[PDB]
Design a protein around this ligand. Structure first.
Ligand SMILES: CSc1ccc(Br)cc1CC(=O)N1CCC[C@H](C(N)=O)CC1
Ligand SMILES: [Zn+2]
Length: 139
C-alpha cells in the first residue's frame, strides 16, 4: 500500500484505489496502473521533474529503503493477474530489487523529489509507475 500526496491530489495504484478515491476521481489510466483523486488537505510530497535513472525506494515487505538503478519509462508486458488481463503497461520503469505484491504504493525518490510508485515485480525485480510526466500535479 501507499500513496503520493501532492497539492490537493492523492496518487495511488489504480488497482488499490478505494471507494473514496473513485468518488473523488480526477484522472485514471488502466494502462499505467495509476489513479489520482482530489483531497481537502494540502499534501506533504513534491514531484521530481528530471531524467534521473537512480534513486531509493521504500520496500514495505522489508521495512527498509533500497537504492536502485531503473530503466527509462517504457511499455512492458505484464501477465494477467486478479486485477488486469494480460496487457502492456505503459510508463513503467524496471529495476533489480526485492518486491512482493503488497509492496505496491511504495515511493521511489531521487534527489529532486518523488519519481513514482511500486506497481509490478517478482523474482528479484521491482517495477515503478512513473509520475514525472504528469505536470498538472504541480498546479
Ligand atoms: C510489487 S507487485 C509483485 C511483486 C512480486 C510478485 Br511474485 C508479483 C507481483 C505482481 C503482482 O502482485 N501483481 C498484482 C498487481 C497488479 C500489477 C500490475 N501493475 O499490473 C502486476 C501483478
Ligand atoms: Zn531526479
Amino acid at each position: 500500500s501507499g500513496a503520493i500526496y501532492v497539492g490537493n491530489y492523492r496518487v495511488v495504484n489504480r488497482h488499490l484505489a478505494t471507494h473514496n478515491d473513485w468518488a473523488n476521481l480526477v484522472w485514471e489510466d488502466s494502462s499505467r496502473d495509476l489513479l489520482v483523486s482530489s483531497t481537502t488537505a494540502q499534501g506533504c510530497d513534491t514531484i521530481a521533474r528530471c531524467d534521473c535513472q537512480t534513486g531509493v525506494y521504500y520496500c514495505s515487505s522489508r521495512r527498509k529503503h533500497y537504492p536502485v538503478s531503473f530503466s527509462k519509462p517504457s511499455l512492458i508486458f505484464v501477465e494477467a493477474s486478479e486485477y488486469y488481463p494480460a496487457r502492456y503497461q505503459s510508463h513503467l520503469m524496471l529495476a533489480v530489487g526485492h518486491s512482493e505484491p503488497g509492496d505496491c504504493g511504495g515511493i521511489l525518490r531521487c534527489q529532486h523529489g518523488v519519481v513514482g510508485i511500486v506497481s509490478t515485480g517478482g523474482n528479484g525485480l521491482v517495477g515503478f509507475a512513473d509520475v514525472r510526466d504528469l505536470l498538472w500535479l504541480d498546479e
